Amino acid sequence: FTTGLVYDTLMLKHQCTCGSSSSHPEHAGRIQSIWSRLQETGLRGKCECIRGRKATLEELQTVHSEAHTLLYGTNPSVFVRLPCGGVGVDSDTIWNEVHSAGAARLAVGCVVELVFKVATGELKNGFAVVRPPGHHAEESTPMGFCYFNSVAVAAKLLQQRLSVSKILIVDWDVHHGNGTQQAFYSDPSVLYMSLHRYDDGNFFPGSGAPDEVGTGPGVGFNVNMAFTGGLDPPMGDAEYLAAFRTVVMPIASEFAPDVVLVSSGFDAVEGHPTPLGGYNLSARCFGYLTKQLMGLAGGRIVLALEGGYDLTAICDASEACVSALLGNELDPLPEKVLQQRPNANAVRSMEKVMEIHSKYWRCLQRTTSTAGRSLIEAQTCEN
Amino acid sequence: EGSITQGTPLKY
Ligand SMILES: [K+]
Ligand SMILES: [K+]
Ligand SMILES: [Zn+2]
Ligand SMILES: [Zn+2]
Numbered sequence: 001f002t003t004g005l006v007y008d009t010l011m012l013k014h015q016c017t018c019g020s021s022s023s024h025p026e027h028a029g030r031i032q033s034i035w036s037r038l039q040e041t042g043l044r045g046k047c048e049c050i051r052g053r054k055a056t057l058e059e060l061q062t063v064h065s066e067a068h069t070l071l072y073g074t075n076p077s078v079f080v081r082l083p084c085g086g087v088g089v090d091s092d093t094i095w096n097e098v099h100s101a102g103a104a105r106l107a108v109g110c111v112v113e114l115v116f117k118v119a120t121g122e123l124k125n126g127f128a129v130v131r132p133p134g135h136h137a138e139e140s141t142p143m144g145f146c147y148f149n150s151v152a153v154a155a156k157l158l159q160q161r162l163s164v165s166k167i168l169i170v171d172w173d174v175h176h177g178n179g180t181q182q183a184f185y186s187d188p189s190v191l192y193m194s195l196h197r198y199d200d201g202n203f204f205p206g207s208g209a210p211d212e213v214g215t216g217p218g219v220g221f222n223v224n225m226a227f228t229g230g231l232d233p234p235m236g237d238a239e240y241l242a243a244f245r246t247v248v249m250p251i252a253s254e255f256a257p258d259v260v261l262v263s264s265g266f267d268a269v270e271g272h273p274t275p276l277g278g279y280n281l282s283a284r285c286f287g288y289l290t291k292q293l294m295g296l297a298g299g300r301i302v303l304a305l306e307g308g309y310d311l312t313a314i315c316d317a318s319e320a321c322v323s324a325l326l327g328n329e330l331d332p333l334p335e336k337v338l339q340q341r342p343n344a345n346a347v348r349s350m351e352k353v354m355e356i357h358s359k360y361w362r363c364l365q366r367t368t369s370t371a372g373r374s375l376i377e378a379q380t381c382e383n
Numbered sequence: 384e385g386s387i388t389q390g391t392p393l394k395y
Contacts (some may be wrong), residue, residue, distance in 0.1 A: 025388065092387050136387075144387045175387065204385055206392025275390035 001124035003325045004117060006050035006110040007035050011131050014103035016094040018084040024094055025276060025309040026145035031129045034305070037315040038129075043322045050117060050126070052110035054102060055153065059112065062156035063149050063183050068140045072147045075101050093142050100147075104132055108150040115154040115302045119162055119259055125294070125325045126302040127264070129318070133306040135177035135263045136205060144175065144205060151263050151304050152183040155190055158259060165189060168257035170248070170293060171196070172240075172286075173265020173306040174277045176208030176224070180263065186218040191255045195243060197235075197268075197279065198226035198349075210353045213360070220360030223251055225353050229345030231278045237285035237337045239346035240268070241375055244292055246350050246367040247357075252296055254363045260293055260301040266308025266317040276309055283313065284331050287320030291330065301325070338376045347372045 012028040021027055038044045060069040071078065072095075079087050079095060088094040107130040114126040134151060136144030151169060158164045169184070171177040171194040184190040197203045214222035225243050227235055252260075266286070267277040294301055303321055308314040324330065342350070350371040358364040370378060385391035 143393070201392055204387045204390050204392055206385060206394060275388065 003047045003322065004050045004114055004123040004126040005038065005044060005047045005129065005322070006052050006114040006126065007031065007129040008052040008106055008110060010106055011103045013096070013099035014132055015096055015099070016084065016086040017096060018082070018086040020084055023084050026132060028131070029311065030309065030314060031131050031305070033311045033315050034129050034318045037319055038322060041319055043319065043326065046326050047322065048123060050114050052106055053113055054105040055108040055112060055148070059153055059157060060105070060108060060148055062160065063139065063152045064137070065140045072142065073101055073105055089142050093145055093147070104147040107132055107134065108148045108153050111150040111304045112154045112157055115158065115261065118300055118302050119158055119164065124299055127318070127322050127325060128302065128304040130305050133265070135171060135173060135180050135265070135306050136175070138179045138182055146179065149179045149183060151261050152180050155184070155261060159189070164258050166256060166258045167191070168252055168255060168260045168296060169193065169263065170252070170260065171263035171265070172268065172289065173263050174268035174279055175204055175265065175307060176226070177263055178205050178207040181208070181212070181222055184218065185214050185222060186216045188218050188221050191221050191223070191252070191257065193223045193225065193248060193252065195225040195240065195248070196227065197277070198228050199230050200228055210356050213356060220357065223247070223353070223357055225350070227346060227349045229348070231274065232345065233343050235279045235281070235343070235346055236340070237282050237333070238340040238374065239342045240281060240285060240289065242342040242346065242371060242373070243350055244289060245375070245378060246371045247353055249292060250363050250367055251357065251361050254361050257297045258300070260297045262293065262301065262303040263306045264303035264321065265306035266314040269308065269310065269313035269317050271313050272310050283316035283320045284333065285337070286317045287324040287330050288333065290321045290324040294324070339374055341374045342372060
């Protein structure tokens with residue numbers, strides 16, 4: 001069955017007026033380079049071309065308050081004059097008074113159109129080359145280059161329109177997705193699962209402690225795989241693959257989702273500036289992480305772009321992910337990755353997360369505690 | 384006030 005891609009050049013229009021491209025890492029060229037890489041590699045010809053649309057204000061209001069959708073979804077004060085000279089709500093999130101409202105709605109709508117085409121069976125899986133990223137946005141607070149939470153809106157719309165009972169949201173963007181967590185913090189029917197640098201709250205945005213397990217009926221359905229200890233050593237492929245083998249897959253498998261949405265951030269890839277990420281994930285590792293998620297929910301999966309700001313890194317990672325969604329055979333993992341053990345900081349983080357969520361997920365016992373094993377050592381003991 | 388550009392967490 002066909003994989004689907006969605007992309008629109010109107011999202012390029014979301015740009016600061018200052019004319020200083022260096023000051024805004026979330027710039028229009030992040031998706032243009034990605035779409036160009038999908039064309040030159042021939043992957044775009046293997047996928048269906050999905051046309052986007054702007055999200056309706058009622059669609060945005062499933063997640064955000066009406067005052068938030070009217071402030072940032074429409075045009076004729078929270079706005080301020082930035083040091084760069086452009087308008088914005090804060091130093092991070094610039095606002096173009098002409099084009100930005102149509103770009104944010106187009107990003108939410110391209111994700112909703114792709115997710116519904118996969119959920120309804122018009123596509124096997126999808127990948128959304130969309131900007132601005134949405135996972136940091138809250139019910140009324142834009143932040144982190146985010147305005148509307150595109151993944152959260154597509155998840156709420158899957159419930160209110162298709163009555164899906166189980167929805168898995170993986171968030172492997174290096175930053176915690178505070179808005180995707182807040183949107184479903186009390187909902188058993190949606191399992192949020194964020195992998196992020198945390199360092200005891202000393203990283204942006206500072207939320208996402210392992211103890212934050214959800215509330216009310218939704219207790220135990222929010223899994224924060226929070227890494228800690230800084231970049232000493234920085235997390236690599238062996239640490240993320242171990243977190244999937246020990247924490248992500250066992251919990252997602254017991255949840256048995258009907259759908260899998262992914263906040264596909266690429267700022268964890270190697271070569272990023274340290275404040276924006278600092279992890280050394282290979283782009284080839286993200287292709288394997290995509291293929292492991294493809295076994296869930298019958299293959300009903302959609303990846304939506306979030307973070308990731310180095311152009312060569314997000315292009316290599318978008319290529320590996322779409323190549324994985326197509327069923328293409330992966331490049332084999334290097335022997336240094338298969339044999340490397342996770343660093344002790346990643347082991348202390350995984351075991352701390354497993355200690356909290358073993359109370360809620362019965363199958364988080366077989367992996368307690370295999371967190372320190374290398375992938376070859378785990379394949380040895382499982383035989 | 385923290386920033387995503389600097390990696391600085393939000394705090395009050
Ligand atoms: K995350
Ligand atoms: K939840
Ligand atoms: Zn500017
Ligand atoms: Zn990010």
